[PDB]
Amino acid sequence: LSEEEIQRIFGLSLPEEXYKKXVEXTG
Amino acid sequence: LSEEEIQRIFGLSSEQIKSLPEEXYKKXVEXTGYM
Numbered sequence: 001l002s003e004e005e006i007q008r009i010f011g012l013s014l015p016e017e018x019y020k021k022x023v024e025x026t027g
Numbered sequence: 028l029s030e031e032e033i034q035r036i037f038g039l040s041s042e043q044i045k046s047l048p049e050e051x052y053k054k055x056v057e058x059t060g061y062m
């Protein structure tokens with residue numbers, strides 16, 4: 001999985017901004 | 028994007044999905060190519 005694919009999949013520090021869009025996931 | 032889809036995409040154990048944002052972050056790090 002590329003960083004560009006993570007942007008597309010999550011609709012976007014990538015790890016930090018991963019964790020926050022994770023939290024927004026847990027609602 | 029559901030928790031179930033994220034579990035499958037990143038191969039997460041039943042244990043890992045207890046900590047989805049943290050185990051997000053770690054599978055984020057492995058994204059960037061770091062360890």
Ligand SMILES: [Mg+2]
Binds near residue numbers: 046048049
């Ligand atoms: Mg937590």
